[PDB]
Design an enzyme around this catalytic site. Structure first.
Site, mmCIF file in Angstrom:
data_model
loop_
_atom_site.group_PDB
_atom_site.id
_atom_site.type_symbol
_atom_site.label_atom_id
_atom_site.label_comp_id
_atom_site.label_asym_id
_atom_site.label_seq_id
_atom_site.Cartn_x
_atom_site.Cartn_y
_atom_site.Cartn_z
ATOM 1 N N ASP A 56 0.844 -1.318 -0.063
ATOM 2 C CA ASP A 56 -0.015 -0.026 -0.137
ATOM 3 C C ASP A 56 0.745 1.237 0.108
ATOM 4 O O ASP A 56 2.143 0.958 -0.313
ATOM 5 C CB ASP A 56 -1.033 -0.063 1.134
ATOM 6 C CG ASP A 56 -0.104 -0.131 2.493
ATOM 7 O OD1 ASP A 56 1.181 -0.343 2.590
ATOM 8 O OD2 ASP A 56 -0.763 0.038 3.476
ATOM 9 N N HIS A 353 1.894 -9.363 -2.801
ATOM 10 C CA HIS A 353 0.812 -8.346 -2.690
ATOM 11 C C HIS A 353 1.393 -7.179 -2.676
ATOM 12 O O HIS A 353 1.652 -6.294 -1.427
ATOM 13 C CB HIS A 353 -0.065 -8.680 -1.485
ATOM 14 C CG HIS A 353 -1.147 -7.627 -1.459
ATOM 15 N ND1 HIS A 353 -2.478 -8.075 -1.970
ATOM 16 C CD2 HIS A 353 -1.360 -6.541 -0.866
ATOM 17 C CE1 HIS A 353 -3.368 -7.293 -1.586
ATOM 18 N NE2 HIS A 353 -2.718 -6.213 -0.807
ATOM 19 N N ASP A 397 1.390 -18.768 -3.178
ATOM 20 C CA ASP A 397 1.758 -17.459 -3.921
ATOM 21 C C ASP A 397 0.717 -16.885 -4.883
ATOM 22 O O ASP A 397 0.528 -17.039 -5.849
ATOM 23 C CB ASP A 397 3.035 -17.838 -4.770
ATOM 24 C CG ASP A 397 3.723 -16.985 -5.578
ATOM 25 O OD1 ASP A 397 3.675 -15.592 -5.167
ATOM 26 O OD2 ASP A 397 4.442 -17.149 -6.509
ATOM 27 N N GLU A 406 1.699 -10.915 1.574
ATOM 28 C CA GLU A 406 2.035 -9.274 1.702
ATOM 29 C C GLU A 406 3.621 -9.391 1.946
ATOM 30 O O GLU A 406 4.232 -10.367 2.712
ATOM 31 C CB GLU A 406 1.228 -8.552 2.471
ATOM 32 C CG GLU A 406 1.143 -6.891 1.963
ATOM 33 C CD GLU A 406 0.127 -6.108 2.374
ATOM 34 O OE1 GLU A 406 -0.677 -6.591 3.337
ATOM 35 O OE2 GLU A 406 0.053 -4.932 1.768
#
Ligand SMILES: OC[C@H]1O[C@@H](O[C@H]2[C@H](O)[C@@H](O)[C@H](O)O[C@@H]2CO)[C@H](O)[C@@H](O)[C@@H]1O
Ligand SMILES: [Ca+2]
Ligand code: NA
Ligand code: NA
Ligand code: NA
Ligand code: NA
Length: 425
Positions: A56, A353, A397, A406
């Site tokens: 993020d 991620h 994965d 993540e």
């Protein structure tokens, strides 16, 4: 057998890929460019820079500061292991330290977050192309955060030690801020994620007194001033730490206290480590991972590996600690037959991620389709340690599995130091 140095070099590249703001000219990540150039405080203060936390684009001050302190600690105490990569590692962590100084807008105001976690997560795309509002929140006497502030002071104080020899002026800037920020933390007591409630869904703080201890210890180390030890002695760790992490500093404080001759702390550190060794209280997977939790299992193990290597340097359970740390890092690197480090080794994760790594090369558009694509990430996020497997070694994965897959600042922090520690053996 494993190329630990290659991994350490890649870990530094992970942090480069997490940079926000105006990137340095020598930026080694060709798929990252300038971003979040308007990040600012509520009075217009420049808050550009720092590291994006995970996959993020939020700048979460507690894990960012813990990451810095933890990285710095390894560069100070495992310097020989860093070897010819130490200067690169030192330059890397300046990204965080410079940001913390910008966040410290006045003596008793410290910015602790830029970005709304929920709003940020509703976007999928390149950080360079964000258009959403990015609120900034600070800690003040009426909205205190002894945890975030104490950790920020710790990072700056540790930084002052690391940089004293090579860059005295910088070290003296770091220490001046560390003193003032720690005073803020100590004089204004509270949980930062109460003061910045947006953070309470992401980096909820369980307690602040461990940061008050930790920060005081680092300031004692940085200054020699007895009053900091007296302050540390007001907040001594009680009982056995559950783990070492961005939330819990006690195990780290135990190593520092042991280094200063605290006998209770040395016994507590022994009791912590023995639990993590085989046949202790920590679950072991069948393939040998010391497994603490569903989310970020490899991070928790790496953090204990780093504590174990540092404790070994203090003569605590020395050989067994080093055996443990190696076993855990070897699990991360390949002992199960595949790597858990992006861009490294045999069959590394292909789909961590991570918004930017999921995007095709510029100038192609990047959006929510990139989140769910079964194809490998188009960009390789070299160096990132992924969340890791469940209690029976199962791992997927899958980009959408942000528990398994993540990546985060804090995940790599103990890990990078542990690699340095193994490289000294
Ligand atoms: O504790 C989480 C969750 O575990 C579930 O068991 C898992 C086990 O943890 C996992 O490693 C294995 O690979 O799969 C099983 C089955 O999903 C358990 O069934 C839940 O009750 C529990 O909440
Ligand atoms: Ca804490
Ligand atoms: Na409360
Ligand atoms: Na405790
Ligand atoms: Na046991
Ligand atoms: Na031993």
């Amino acid at each position: 057998q494993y190329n630990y140095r290659e991994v350490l070099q890649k870990s530094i590249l992970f942090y480069a890929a997490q940079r926000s703001g105006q990137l340095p000219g020598n930026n080694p990540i060709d798929w990252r460019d300038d971003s979040a150039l308007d990040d600012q405080g509520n009075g217009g203060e420049d808050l550009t820079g720092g590291w994006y936390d995970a996959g993020d684009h939020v700048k979460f001050g507690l894990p960012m500061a813990w990451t810095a302190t933890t990285l710095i600690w390894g560069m100070i105490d495992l310097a020989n292991g860093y070897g010819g990569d130490r200067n690169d590692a030192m330059q890397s962590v300046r990204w965080a330290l410079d940001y913390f100084m910008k966040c410290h807008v006045s003596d008793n105001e410290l910015y602790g977050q830029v970005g709304d976690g929920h709003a940020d997560h509703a976007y999928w795309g390149r950080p360079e192309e964000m258009t959403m509002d990015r609120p900034a929140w600070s800690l003040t006497p009426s909205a205190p955060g002894s945890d975030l502030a104490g950790e920020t002071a710790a990072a700056l104080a540790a930084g002052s030690i690391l940089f004293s020899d090579s860059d005295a002026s910088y070290a003296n800037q770091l220490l001046d801020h560390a003193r003032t920020i720690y005073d803020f933390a100590y004089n204004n007591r509270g949980i930062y994620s109460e003061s910045i409630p947006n953070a309470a869904d992401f980096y909820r703080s369980s307690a602040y007194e461990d940061e008050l201890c930790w920060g005081a210890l680092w300031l004692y180390r940085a200054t020699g001033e007895q009053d900091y030890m007296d302050k540390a002695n007001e907040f001594l760790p009680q009982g056995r730490p559950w783990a070492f992490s961005w939330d819990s500093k006690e195990a780290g404080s135990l190593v520092l206290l042991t280094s200063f001759g605290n006998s209770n702390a040395r016994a507590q550190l022994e009791d912590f480590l023995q639990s993590w060794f085989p046949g202790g209280d920590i679950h072991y997977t069948p393939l040998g991972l010391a497994w603490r939790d569903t989310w970020g299992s490899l991070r928790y193990s790496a953090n204990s590996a780093f504590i174990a290597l540092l404790a070994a340097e203090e003569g605590v359970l020395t050989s067994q600690a080093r055996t443990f740390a190696r076993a855990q890092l070897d699990y991360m690197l390949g002992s199960t037959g595949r790597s858990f480090v992006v861009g490294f080794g045999t069959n590394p994760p292909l789909r961590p991620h991570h918004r930017a790594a999921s995007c095709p090369d510029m100038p192609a558009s990047c959006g929510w389709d990139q989140a769910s694509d079964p194809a490998p990430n188009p960009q390789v996020l070299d160096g990132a340690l992924v969340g890791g497997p469940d209690d029976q070694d199962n791992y997927n994965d899958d980009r959408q599995d942000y528990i398994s897959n993540e990546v985060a600042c804090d995940y790599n922090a103990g890990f990078q130091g542990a690699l340095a520690g193994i490289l000294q053996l």
